[PDB]
C-alpha cells in the first residue's frame, strides 16, 4: 500500500533565486520517490516607445540598434540609392514613430525549464550531506538513461513543448517508372512555453528527485534508519534571468527600388531589440509528494564550452544543455515574381519583385570539440588516445542493453571499466566537465 | 508445431451493420491467437450537377451553401465592391455552371478503420458470455500497451496511413558563429486510405481478437475444457456510415479587385459541399485464423466527450478515438507580390497581389477536460483530488517498466492500487467513460 501525501516548505514563501528547504517526516515505514510540484506565475513585459528616424541606441549583448535615414545603409553612414525605412510588428502590423507606449517585447522560456530550476540539490542529516548533484547530472541522465518510449511524459512534466501534426488538401502528382496520383502534405507546429508570446500563462512543473535509493522499489531506504528530526532537503533555485527571455516586438522594414531593366523591388527586415522589464515571478503551491509505502562499470562524461552558459551568449537559453560547439545556419525564404508589360521586346522581364519574411529559419548545428580522450590511472593508462566517436557512438551502441540509449550530442561520452580526464582539442576556450559514475 | 487453419462465417455473407458469427472447432490441443481477415470493396460517389449563380442550398450538418452573385459578399445580401465568383475543382480545373453530371465528391476512410469495425466482440459458450469488450477498450490498449517499435506493422494491419519522406535539391546557406554551406530540405507526404481520392481501392484488414488467454503463449486455454459445440464468437460490425466519409469535389473561387493605390487583387476559395450517395461496400474473404499448437494493480481510464462520436460532428471521423476536447487551428499560406510600373514616384507599389491556396492547413489541438479526479472506496477515500497531469503523465512515466508506454492524450489516465470515478471539470456537456482493469 502506498499513499501520496504532501509536505509544505519549511522556509516559507520561496522566491526565485534563494535557498528552499523541506523537512521529511516519518509517515511510512519506507519512502520511495520524491516529486516537487511548483506553479510559476504569469509573465509579460513593459510598454516602450517607438524610435525617431535616424536614432541609434545601445542594445543588448553590446549590439548597436539603429533606425537609418532614407537613402542610407544599415549603418546610417554608407549611402544607398533608394532605401526607405518604416516600423512594423512581428506580424506585419504598422507602428507610427514617436508614439508613447507603442509596443511590448515578447517573452519565452528556456528549454526544459523544469531542469534548470533545481540548480543544486542536497540531502542533509544534521549536516553531513549524503548526496549532492547539480543541473548537469540531470542532463546526462536524460540524454542516456531515459528509454525514449517515455519521452512525451517527461517533456510534459518539465514543461517542454511538443510538436503537433497537420495536413493539407489533396494534390496532384505525376509518377514515373523505369501516371497520376493524389497525395497530401504533412506539416508540424509548436505552441508551448518556448514559443514567444505576449502573455505566458502559469506553468506547472513536476520535478523528480534522484537519490541512489530512489532508483528501485527494493532499494528505498527506510524512514527509521536515522533519527527523525535530522532529515532535510535543500534546493538552490535558479534566478529569474536564467529562466525567461525576451524576443523583439518591433522590426524595421527596408524597401528598396532599383532602377533599370528589370526594375526591382526588395523588402527586408531587421530587429530593433531594446531590453525591457519582466515582472517578478512568484512560486505557488510548492509541494513535495513524499510516497509512503505501508507494510564501477559505467561513466558518462560531458564536455561543455563555457560559452554555452555565459550571460553574454545571445542563445544561452537554447544551448544551456548542449554538449558541443553550437553554430547557426540561417535560411531566408523569398517570394519571387517577374512581369512583362508588353509584347514588343520580351527577352527580359519589365519588372521583378522579391518579398522576404519578417523572421528567418534557424538551424542549430552541434559540432565536436574533442579529438582524443584519455582517462588514465596511477596503475596503467587505461583508455589512451581513443577517437571521439568510438566513445561517443560505438560504446553506447554495443554495451548497455536496452537501458542505455545512444545519445545525440557529440560531446556526451561513455566509457566502460569492468581518474584524470585529458583531451586533445582544436577549440580555444574554457571547457566544463560533468561526471556520473553508475553501476548496472 | 503450429499452423494456421481457416474458419468460415457461420451466418453467411456478412454485411456492414449486422451480427456476424464464427464457430470455433477443436482442431489442435490449444488455440493461442485469433485474427479476422476481411476485404472491403471499392468505393466512389455519384455524379452531381453544377449550380447556377445566385443559388443557396441546405448542405450537411444544417449548413447553408451559397453561390453568390457578382458584387456581393459570401451571404449574398451584403454588397461588396468587385467580387467575381466562378467554379473550380479541388485542383483548379474549371467547371461550367449548369452542366449535368459535372463533378463527383471524393471519398476517404476513418482513422484506424480496423478498430472501428468491431464495435462489439462477444465470446459465448451456450450463452453465458465469458468476455465482452467494445471499440473503446481497443483504443486504450493501443495508446498504452503497444511498444512503439511495433507500430508500423500495427498501422499497416488496421489500414492507417504512414508518411513517406522526400528530399529536395541542394541549397546554399550562410553560417554564423560567435561562411557558406550546402544543405537539403526534408518533406513528408501521405497516400493512404485516409487521403481523399476519387476511387478507393479495396482495403484488406487484419484484426486481432484479445481475450484474457491470448496475452501469453503459456496462458492460452485448451480446446477440450469446454464441450465442442458450445463455442461461438459474435461480432457486431459497424455501419457503412461510420467508416467512410466524403470531401467536397467542387469549390467556389472569389476574385476581388480593390481600386486605389496600390490596386490589389485577392483570390479566395469556399467549398460547395452537398452530400451524395456512396455505393454499398461488400465484405469478401471473411476468414478467421486460429492457431493450432500441436503437442488488481492497474487501471486505464479514458474521458471522452460525446461530441467526439456524435453524428452532428463534422470531424467525427478524425476525432472518434481522441480522449479530450479537440479544437482546430487553420493556417492559410499566401503568395504575395508587389510591382511598380515607373520610376517617377516609387514610395508605394503600383500593384499588389495575394494568391491563396484552395484548401487550408488544419492542426487538431487536444485539451484536457478534467481538473481533478478521485476514485473513492467504500472504506477510504483512496485517490483524492489529485491533479490531472499527475495521473496522465507522471504515473505512466514512473510505474510500468518498458511494457507501459506514456500516452499522448490528456484524457487517458492511469492509476495504481497495489470504484466510484468522480471528477471536476470546466467543460459543460456529456462525458463518456471507458475502463480497463489489468494486472502485470
Amino acid at each position: 500500500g502506498f499513499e501520496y501525501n504532501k509536505v509544505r516548505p519549511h522556509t516559507g514563501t520561496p522566491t526565485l533565486g534563494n535557498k528552499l528547504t523541506f523537512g521529511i517526516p516519518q509517515y511510512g515505514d519506507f519512502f520511495h520517490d520524491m516529486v516537487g510540484h511548483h506553479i510559476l506565475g504569469a509573465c509579460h513585459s513593459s510598454w516602450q516607445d517607438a524610435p525617431i528616424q535616424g536614432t541609434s541606441q545601445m542594445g543588448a549583448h553590446g549590439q548597436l540598434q539603429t533606425f537609418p535615414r532614407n537613402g542610407y545603409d544599415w549603418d546610417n553612414q554608407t549611402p544607398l540609392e533608394g532605401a526607405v525605412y518604416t516600423l512594423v510588428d512581428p506580424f506585419g502590423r504598422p507602428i507610427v514613430p514617436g508614439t508613447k507606449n507603442a509596443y511590448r517585447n515578447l517573452v519565452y522560456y528556456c528549454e526544459y525549464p523544469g531542469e534548470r530550476l533545481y540548480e543544486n540539490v542536497r540531502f542533509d542529516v544534521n549536516g553531513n550531506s549524503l548526496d549532492e548533484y547539480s543541473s548537469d547530472v540531470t542532463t546526462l541522465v536524460r540524454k542516456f538513461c531515459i528509454p525514449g518510449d517515455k519521452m512525451t511524459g517527461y517533456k510534459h512534466l518539465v514543461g517542454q513543448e511538443v510538436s503537433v501534426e497537420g495536413t493539407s488538401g489533396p494534390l496532384l502528382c505525376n509518377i514515373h517508372d523505369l501516371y497520376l496520383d493524389i497525395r497530401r502534405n504533412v506539416h508540424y507546429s509548436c505552441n508551448g512555453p518556448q514559443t514567444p508570446k505576449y502573455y505566458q500563462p502559469p506553468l506547472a512543473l513536476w520535478i523528480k528527485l534522484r537519490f541512489w535509493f530512489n532508483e528501485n522499489v527494493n532499494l528505498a531506504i527506510p524512514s527509521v534508519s536515522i533519527p527523525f528530526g535530522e532529515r532535510f532537503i535543500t534546493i538552490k533555485l535558479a534566478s529569474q534571468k536564467d529562466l525567461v527571455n525576451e524576443f523583439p516586438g518591433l522590426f524595421v522594414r527596408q524597401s528598396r527600388f532599383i532602377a533599370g531593366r528589370p526594375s526591382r523591388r526588395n523588402i527586408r527586415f531587421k530587429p530593433w531589440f531594446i531590453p525591457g522589464v519582466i515582472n517578478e515571478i512568484s512560486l505557488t503551491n510548492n509541494e513535495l509528494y513524499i510516497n509512503n509505502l505501508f507494510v564501477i562499470e559505467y561513466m558518462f562524461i560531458g564536455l561543455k564550452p563555457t560559452w554555452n552558459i555565459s550571460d553574454q551568449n545571445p542563445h544561452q537559453h537554447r544551448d544551456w544543455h548542449k554538449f558541443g560547439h553550437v553554430v547557426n545556419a540561417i535560411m531566408q525564404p523569398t517570394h519571387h515574381a517577374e512581369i512583362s508589360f508588353q509584347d514588343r521586346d520580351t527577352a527580359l522581364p519589365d519588372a521583378c519583385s522579391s518579398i522576404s519574411d519578417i523572421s528567418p529559419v534557424t538551424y542549430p548545428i552541434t559540432l565536436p570539440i574533442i579529438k582524443n580522450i584519455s582517462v588514465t590511472a596511477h596503475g596503467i593508462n587505461l583508455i589512451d588516445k581513443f577517437p571521439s566517436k568510438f566513445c561517443s557512438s560505438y560504446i553506447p551502441f554495443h554495451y548497455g542493453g536496452n537501458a542505455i540509449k545512444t545519445p545525440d550530442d557529440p560531446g556526451a561520452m561513455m566509457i566502460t571499466f569492468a581518474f584524470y580526464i585529458s583531451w586533445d582539442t582544436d577549440y580555444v576556450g574554457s571547457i566544463t566537465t560533468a561526471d556520473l559514475v553508475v553501476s548496472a | 508445431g503450429f499452423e494456421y487453419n481457416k474458419v468460415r462465417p457461420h451466418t453467411g455473407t456478412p454485411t456492414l451493420g449486422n451480427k456476424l458469427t464464427f464457430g470455433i472447432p477443436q482442431y489442435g490441443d490449444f488455440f493461442h491467437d485469433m485474427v479476422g481477415h476481411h476485404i472491403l470493396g471499392a468505393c466512389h460517389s455519384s455524379w452531381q450537377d453544377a449550380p447556377i449563380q445566385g443559388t443557396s442550398q441546405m448542405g450537411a450538418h444544417g449548413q447553408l451553401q451559397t453561390f453568390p452573385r457578382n458584387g456581393y459578399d459570401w451571404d449574398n445580401q451584403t454588397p461588396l465592391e468587385g467580387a467575381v465568383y466562378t467554379l473550380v475543382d479541388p485542383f483548379g480545373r474549371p467547371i461550367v455552371p449548369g452542366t449535368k453530371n459535372a463533378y463527383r465528391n471524393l471519398v476517404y476512410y476513418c482513422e484506424y478503420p480496423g478498430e472501428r469495425l468491431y464495435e462489439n466482440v462477444r465470446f459465448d459458450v451456450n450463452g453465458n458470455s465469458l468476455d465482452e469488450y467494445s471499440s473503446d477498450v481497443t483504443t486504450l490498449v493501443r495508446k498504452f500497451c503497444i511498444p512503439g517499435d511495433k507500430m508500423t506493422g500495427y498501422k499497416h494491419l488496421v489500414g492507417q496511413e504512414v508518411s513517406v519522406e522526400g528530399t529536395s535539391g541542394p541549397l546554399l546557406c550562410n553560417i554564423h558563429d560567435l561562411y557558406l554551406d550546402i544543405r537539403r530540405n526534408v518533406h513528408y507526404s501521405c497516400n493512404g486510405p485516409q487521403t481523399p481520392k476519387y476511387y478507393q481501392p479495396p482495403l484488406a484488414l487484419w484484426i486481432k481478437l484479445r481475450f484474457w488467454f491470448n496475452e501469453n503463449v503459456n496462458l492460452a486455454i485448451p480446446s477440450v475444457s469446454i464441450p465442442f459445440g458450445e463455442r461461438f464468437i459474435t461480432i457486431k460490425l459497424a455501419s457503412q456510415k461510420d467508416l467512410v466519409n466524403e470531401f467536397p469535389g467542387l469549390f467556389v473561387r472569389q476574385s476581388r479587385f480593390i481600386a486605389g493605390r496600390p490596386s490589389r487583387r485577392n483570390i479566395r476559395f469556399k467549398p460547395w459541399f452537398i452530400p451524395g450517395v456512396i455505393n454499398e461496400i461488400s465484405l469478401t474473404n471473411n476468414e478467421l485464423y486460429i492457431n493450432n499448437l500441436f503437442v488488481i494493480e492497474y487501471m486505464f481510464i479514458g474521458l471522452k466527450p460525446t461530441w467526439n462520436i456524435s453524428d452532428q460532428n463534422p470531424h467525427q471521423h478524425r476525432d472518434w478515438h481522441k480522449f479530450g476536447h479537440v479544437v482546430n487551428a487553420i493556417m492559410q499560406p499566401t503568395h504575395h507580390a508587389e510591382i511598380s510600373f515607373q520610376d517617377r514616384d516609387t514610395a508605394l507599389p503600383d500593384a499588389c497581389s495575394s494568391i491563396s491556396d484552395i484548401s487550408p492547413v488544419t492542426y487538431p489541438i487536444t485539451l484536457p477536460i478534467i481538473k481533478n479526479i478521485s476514485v473513492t472506496a467504500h472504506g477510504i477515500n483512496l485517490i483524492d483530488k489529485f491533479p490531472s497531469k499527475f495521473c496522465s503523465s507522471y504515473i505512466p512515466f514512473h510505474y510500468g517498466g518498458n511494457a507501459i508506454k506514456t500516452p499522448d492524450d490528456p484524457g487517458a489516465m492511469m492509476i495504481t492500487f497495489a470504484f466510484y470515478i468522480s471528477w471536476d471539470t470546466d467543460y459543460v456537456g456529456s462525458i463518456t467513460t471507458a475502463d480497463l482493469v489489468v494486472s502485470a
Epitope: I52, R69, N70, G71, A83, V84, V96, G98 | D345
Partner: antibody
Framework: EKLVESGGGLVKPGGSLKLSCVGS????????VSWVRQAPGKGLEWLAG??????????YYADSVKGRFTISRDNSQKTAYLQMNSLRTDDTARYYC???????????????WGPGVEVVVS | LQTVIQEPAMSVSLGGTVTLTCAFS?????????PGWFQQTPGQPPRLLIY???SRPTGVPSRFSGAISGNRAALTITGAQAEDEADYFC??????????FGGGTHLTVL
C-alpha cells in the same frame, strides 16, 4: 538630392500667390517637405510642412499663418506647392524648401535646402 | 511664452575653442527636444552641422561638437578657422508640431 524653387515675385497687398518646389532625388516621394522663411535682418521662422508616403499623409501649420497658407504635394511630377492667401506688408522675406531624409515631419532633420526665391509684398 | 534665446554675439581667437549656448525662456532643454544647429554664410542657404545634438551629416568636419550642459544646448568649435565667420542658429522641437528657431548668433574670429 537638390531642390529648385520658382514662382516668387512682387505681389500687390491683399493678393494670393503660389510657390513651386521641384526635387530631383531618388526618394522625394518618401521625404518630408517643409517651408521656411527669413525676414531681412532677422532669424529663421518655420511656416508649414507635409509628411511623406508610408503612413497617413497630413499637413501641419504654425500659429501665425494657419488658415492663410496651404501646402500640397504632387509625387508624380516631384513637386511641392505652397499657396498663400491675403498677403500682408510684413511678409517680404526669402522662402526656402527643406526636405528631410525622413517620412514623418514631427522632429524632422531638415538637411537639404534650396536656393530660395525672394518674395516681396508692396 | 516658449521662446528661444542665445547670445547676440561671440568672439574667438584663431585656433581657439569657443562654445555657443541656446536655451528656452522658461522650460528646460533635454534630449527629447532634438536640438539642431545651422550655419548660414551670407548670401547662401543655411547648412546643417549638428542634428539630434550629437550626429554630423557627411561633409562636416569633426571639430564641431554638440551636447546638453545642465539645462542648455551647447555647440563647441575647437580649432577655429577663418571660414567659420558666419551666423549660427539653434532649432528646438517643442511639442510635435512646433519648431521655433533662435535669434541668430554672429561668430567673430579675430
Amino acid at each position: 538630392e537638390k531642390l529648385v524653387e520658382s514662382g516668387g515675385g512682387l505681389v500687390k497687398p491683399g493678393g494670393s500667390l503660389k510657390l513651386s518646389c521641384v526635387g530631383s532625388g531618388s526618394t522625394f516621394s518618401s521625404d518630408a517637405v517643409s517651408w521656411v522663411r527669413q525676414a531681412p535682418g532677422k532669424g529663421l521662422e518655420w511656416l508649414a510642412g507635409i509628411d511623406g508616403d508610408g503612413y497617413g499623409v497630413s499637413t501641419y501649420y504654425a500659429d501665425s499663418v494657419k488658415g492663410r497658407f496651404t501646402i500640397s504635394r504632387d509625387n508624380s511630377q516631384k513637386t511641392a506647392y505652397l499657396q498663400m492667401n491675403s498677403l500682408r506688408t510684413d511678409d517680404t522675406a526669402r522662402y526656402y524648401c527643406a526636405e528631410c531624409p525622413m517620412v514623418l515631419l514631427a522632429k524632422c532633420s531638415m538637411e537639404f535646402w534650396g536656393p530660395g526665391v525672394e518674395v516681396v509684398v508692396s | 511664452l516658449q521662446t528661444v534665446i542665445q547670445e547676440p554675439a561671440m568672439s574667438v581667437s584663431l585656433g581657439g575653442t569657443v562654445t555657443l549656448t541656446c536655451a528656452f525662456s522658461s522650460g528646460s532643454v533635454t534630449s527629447s527636444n532634438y536640438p539642431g544647429w545651422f550655419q548660414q554664410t551670407p548670401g547662401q542657404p543655411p547648412r546643417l552641422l549638428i542634428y539630434q545634438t550629437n550626429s554630423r551629416p557627411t561633409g562636416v568636419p569633426s571639430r564641431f561638437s554638440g551636447a546638453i550642459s545642465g539645462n542648455r544646448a551647447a555647440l563647441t568649435i575647437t580649432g577655429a578657422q577663418a571660414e567659420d565667420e558666419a551666423d549660427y542658429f539653434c532649432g528646438l522641437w517643442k511639442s510635435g508640431t512646433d519648431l521655433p528657431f533662435g535669434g541668430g548668433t554672429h561668430l567673430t574670429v579675430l
